[PDB]
C-alpha cells in the first residue's frame, strides 16, 4: 500500500502550520489581546472547516432540536458551534450541543468543559445549565443511554467523525427516530480511502441514495444530507 | 458626558474573554495542535467579525482589483483576508491585500509581515511576491503615494477604520477614481457616537444617500455600500 | 435533578416583568386609554409569542377550517387568534376558534374568558353569527372526540398543542387526523423541552418525528410546527 | 339548536340587498342600457362570488375538458362561466358547461335558463356549434352516470359541488373520478359549513380530507377547492 | 443495410479536419508554444464535446465521490476531466478519475501499450495540481469491465460515484457495469451515455431498458447536441 | 524592481507545459486523430482561458454585431471564437470576427492564421459567405478608425482588449464607442495588472472605472469585462 | 467589391427552394386543401422569419397601439401579423396593421395585397370594423407624416423597418418618435448588414446605437430590435 495515495499535508502546508505556531507562541501582541486576533493564525485549511460548520449550522436554524458530534478530537467543532449559537440563537436555550467521545490526554473532558463554560457565561441564557454536554465512553453504550435519558430529543444536526463501521452503524441506527425531515446528517470521511467503514455503514443502514449526499463546493468534506430529501 | 452611553463590554463579555485567554495560555492541547483548534478560543463577538469579513469578501469575488484596509490595529482583518483569499481565489495572484497604518509596539509591521508571509507560502501563487503589503505612515501621505506608484489599481474592497474626519475624508477622495460599480466601501464606526468623524467625512465627500448603506442584519458594524447602487 | 437545566427566567427578565406590571397598574394614562397602549407593557418575550402566532395564522389563510388549541392556560393565544381573525378574515364566519382545557385558574374562569372573546367578536363584521369562539371544558381524551362527533363539517386548519403529557397528546393527535388537509398546520408548544417529554414521546408513537418537516421560526425555541403532507 | 350559529345576513346586508333591488327595478337608466350597468347593483358579497369563479376558471385555462356544476340554484355560476368562456376562450368549442339539478325554481325554469345561456352563446366565436351549454334535469345519482355514459370523450377540468347532502355528493365524487386529470379542480360550496355537514362526510368517505390540498381563496369562506393530484 | 443512415462526417467536416491537421504539424508557431494555442486547431465538433464535459462536471461540483469513464478511446475525456478538476477543485484530492478500458511511432509499438502513454499524459496534468503530492488521483484499469469494475469497487469500499460516463457500445458490458455501480450512486449523481439512442450501437439502450428502464429517471440532452444523454439519479 | 511581483509561471506549471508539449509531438495517436484529442494536452491554465471566452460569447448571443480583438498574439482567441460561432450561431453570417495586430511572430504569420480560420469556416453552414474572418495588419490607431469608416454597418457585440499600452488602448476605446449598444461587452486582458498599467490609465482617462460595472468570472484574475450601459 | 461577402443563398438552399416550389405547384393534394398544408412547403429559413415575427408580436400584447411596417416587399410580414392578430387578439379592433411602400411588384399589386388581408379579416371577430389593415402607397418621407397627421390617436406598439436606405430610415425614425411609449418595439431588418449600411448610419444619426439595448433573437442575424425606454 502506497501511503502517498492517502490525503496528507504538502511540505508547504506543514511549513505554514509550523510558522504560524511559532508566531502565535512568540507573539508581540499583548497576551490579553491574542483571543481578539486569532484569525492571524487561522490558515486556509482551518478557515475552510469553520466556514463549513457555519454553513451546516445555517441550514438548521429553522429546525428544532439539538446538535450532536460523534467523535470530537480536541473539540474544534464544539467550540465553533458554541460561538455560532451565540451569533444566531441568543434566545434558544433548547439548542443543546452534545459531544460523544471515548477521549482516549487525561482529564481533557474537564478542560474542554471549562472552555465551553467560558463561552456560555456570556450567553443570553447562560443561567440555564446543561446546554453543552460531553458524554465520555464508547458510543455504542453512551448514545442509546443518552437518548433513553432524553426522550424529549429532536436531532437537528448530527456530525459523524467515528471512522469505523461498527460505531457508525450503531449510532446511525440509534439516532434515526429522533430526526425530522430537514435534519442534517454529516460525515467527516464518507468517501475517504483511509476510512472506508463510514461508507460501508452508510450503505448497510440507509443506502447512499437514501437521500442526496452533498458537498460544499470546493471542499472534499463534509459530505452531508438533508433527511427526507 | 456619561461614558456608559458608549459601547463597552459587559462584565460577562469580559469574563468570557479573560477565561478563554487563560485556557489558551494554559492548554493541555499539544502546542503544535493549537493552530488546529483556534475556534475553541474564538468567542461570539470575534466569530461575528470573521463572518462579516467573509460576507464582504464573498460580495467582491466577481469584482476585479485589490483589498485595502485603512487602520489595521494588530492585523485581525488582514489575517482573515489572507486565509479567505486561499479559500476562494487560489488562481488570482492580482488580489493584493494592502494595509495602511501609522503603527504607533515597535517593529510590529515586521511581525505582521511574517504572519502574512506564513499564510502565503502555501498559496498556489506563493511564488508571486507583493501580494500582501503593509504601508507604514500617515494615510494622507501614503495612500496617494501608493496609488501614484500603482496606476494599475482597481479597488474591489475598501475597509475604513480610521476614526477621524480628516484622514477618512482624504482617503475617500483619493480612492474614488479606482472604484468600479460593484466595489464595496465599508466603515467600522460610521454611526457610532464615540467616533463621529467618519460620518462627518462621509457626509462631506459623498452624502449618506450617495449609495445604499447596509448592515449585515444583527450586527451594528460594519456599515457598507456597493458603489454605483 | 438540576432544576437549572430547565428553562427559567433570568433575574433581569423577572425584573422587567415586575416593573412593567407596576407601571401598567399605576399608570397616569387615563383608564379608558390603557387598552390603546398595551404595547408599552408587552416585553420582548411576550412580543415574540405574538409574532409567532401571527406567523402561524398567516400560513393558513388559504386553508379551510377551524383553529383549535389544546391546553389554553389563561387564554393568551385565543385572544391573539380572535384579534388576528379580525385583521385577516373579516368575511370568514366559518373560522371558528375552539379552546379545550380542564380549566383547573379560578372557578368560573371559562365564563370570564368567553366574555373576553365575546368582546372582541361584537365588533367583527360577522359578529351576529354565534359560536365563532367555543371553550370546551373537560379532559381532551373525551371532549375532543365528542366535539368532532358533534361537528362532522370540521376541517382543522391549525391545531396548537400545549398539553404537556403523553396520554392527552397521543389521544388528540389520533382524533384530529381525519380532519386535516395537506397544508394544515400542527404546532407544538414544548416538543423538545426536557421538562415535558411526553409530547415528543406521543409524536414519535403516533406519527414519527420525520412524518413531516418540523420547523422553528428562526431564533425561537418554540413553537415547533409542521405542514401536513409535506 | 341555535340558528344564529349558522351563517346568515346581517341587517345591513339585508338593507343593501333590498335597496339595490329597488334601484335596479326603478332605474332612470334607459331599459336597453340596464345590462350595460349591472355592476351598479352587484354588491360586495356577490362580486366576491364572481371573482372566485374567475379565479377557479383561470386555474384551468391550460387543462382540457368541460366544466360541471352539481346543484345550480337559479344559474348564477352558469351565466358567470358562459361569460368568462367568452373572455378567455373564443376559440375553444370543446369547453362545454354542464349544469345538473333537479330544478325543484318555477316550472319551466330550465327552459328559461337555457334561453339565457343561448343568448350569451349567439355572439360566441363558435356560436354555430351546439350543445356547448347543457342543462341536465333530474337526480344526479341517475343523471351524472348517464351523462358520462353518453359522453365517453369526457375530460373534467372543473367540477363545482353545491349538492349539500351526503348521498348525492358521494355518488357524484365516485362517478367523476375516472374523468379527472392531474390539475383538474374539484370545488365545494359548503365543505366546512355547520349547516350542511354531508359534503364533508362524503369527502372523508370517498377520498379523505388530505387526499389533496384543500384551499380557500384568501378572505373567503367558500369555495374550498383542490387541484387533483397535488 | 444503407450505411449512410449512420452518422458519418460530411466532406466539409473531413476537409476541415485534414486542413487543421496540416496546419498543426507544419506551423510557424514555435513548437513549445503549441500547447498554448490548441484552440486554433479545435473545430466546432470537438469544442462541443469539451463544453459538454464541462457542463456535466459543473453539475456534480456539490456531489461527493469519483468520476468514472467506461470505454475511454484515446483518453480525450480523461484529459478534459483532469484539466477541469484543476479549474474547479484544487482542494479536492478525493475526486479520483478512473478510466476503464480493454485498450485493444507512428510504427514503433509503445512499450506498455497505449495505457503507458495515457498515464504519462495524466501525470503531466497532475504535477501542477495543488494536491499533486497525493497519488492515485487518476487511475487506468485495463481489462474487461465485467470483471474490472466489480473488482475495483470491492477494492474501494469508500467509493461514491458522482459521474459515470458510458461509452461501451455493447449490451453485456453496459448491463454488468450499470448493475455494479448502482449501490455507489447518490441522489444527484450523474449517469451519462455516449450512444444511448444511436442506431449503430443499440446494445446500450437495450441494457438501459433491461436494468432500469428509460423512465427510471429523466434522460436529458444538452440542447443542440445529440449526445451525451444523461440523467440525475433519483429525479 | 522585483520581477517576482509580476505574475509568472511556477516551476510546476513550466514542467506541465513542457511535458505536454513532448507528449503532443511524440504521440502514438495516429497523426490524423491528434486534432480529435487536443484536450489531452490542454492544461488547467489554458482550459480556463477557453471557458472564459465561452462565457463572454454566451453573453452576446442576443446582441447584434461583430467580435473584435485588439492584439491577437498567435490567434488563440480568434480560433476559439471561430469554433464557438459554429457551436452557437450556424445561421448568423453577420457575426464577423475581426482581429487587429501589428503582427511583429514570423513574417507572413497573418496568411497562416487566415488559413487556420478559413479551415474552420469551410465547414460552417454559411461557409460560402466570405469575409466572416478578417485580419487587419497595422497600428490600431490608424487601422481601427479606417476599418470603421469602411464598414458603417458596424455594430460591436464584443470588444476584447489585449493592447498593453496607453496610447493604442485610448485610441481604440474612443473609436469603438459609437458602435456599441447597451449590452455590448467590453473586455480587458490586463486591466489591473502591475506589468501593463497603461490599459487602466487609458480606461480611467476615456471612461472612468465606474462608467459601468467591471466584473471578473469568479476565480480568474482576467478577463475584466463590463456590459455597456449597466 | 467581392459580392460573396454579402449574404446569399447556398446551392443547397436554392435547391430546397426550387424543389418545394415544384411540389407546391404540382401537388396531388386537392386544390381546396393546399392552404391547410402550407407548412409542407415552408422551409427553415422562412419558418424562422415567421417565428421571429411571432416573438416580436408577443412582446407587445400588453402595449397599446398599432403595427407599422416600412417597406413591405410582397407582404409576407403583413399576412403574418394578420393571422397572429387573430390568434392573440380577437377582441382588439384598435390593433391596426399599416404597411407603407412605394410598391415599385406587378402593377395593381397593392389591390391584390388588400384582397389577401381582407380575406383574413372576413373571419375576424371584429371583421365588421373597417380600416384594420391599411396599405399606404408612396414615398415614406411624404406618406408617414401624412398618415400621422390624419391619425392623431396613433400609438405605435411595433415599428418594423425594411427601407434599406439612410434618408427614408432617418425621416421615419424622426416622425414616429412622438407616438412610441416605453415598451414599444422598434425593429430593423438590416441594421448591421454590409449590403445596406444606411439603416445603421440613420440609427446612429437620430438616436445612437446605445440609445436603447439592441437585441437579436438568438441564432438569427435579423431582426435587430429594441424596447423603447430600456
Residue numbers in the entry:
A (entry chain C), B (entry chain C): 7 to 110, 133 to 257
C (entry chain B), D (entry chain D), F (entry chain B), G (entry chain D): 7 to 110, 132 to 257
E (entry chain E): 7 to 110, 127 to 257
What does the paper say about this structure?
CalS11 uses S-adenosylmethionine (AdoMet, SAM) as the methyl donor.
Superimposition of apo (red) and complexed (blue) CalS11 structures. residues 111–131 are missing in the electron density. of CalS11 shows enhanced mobility in the absence of substrate. binding site is more solvent accessible when no substrate is bound. completely exposed to solvent in many conformations. distributed between closed and open states.
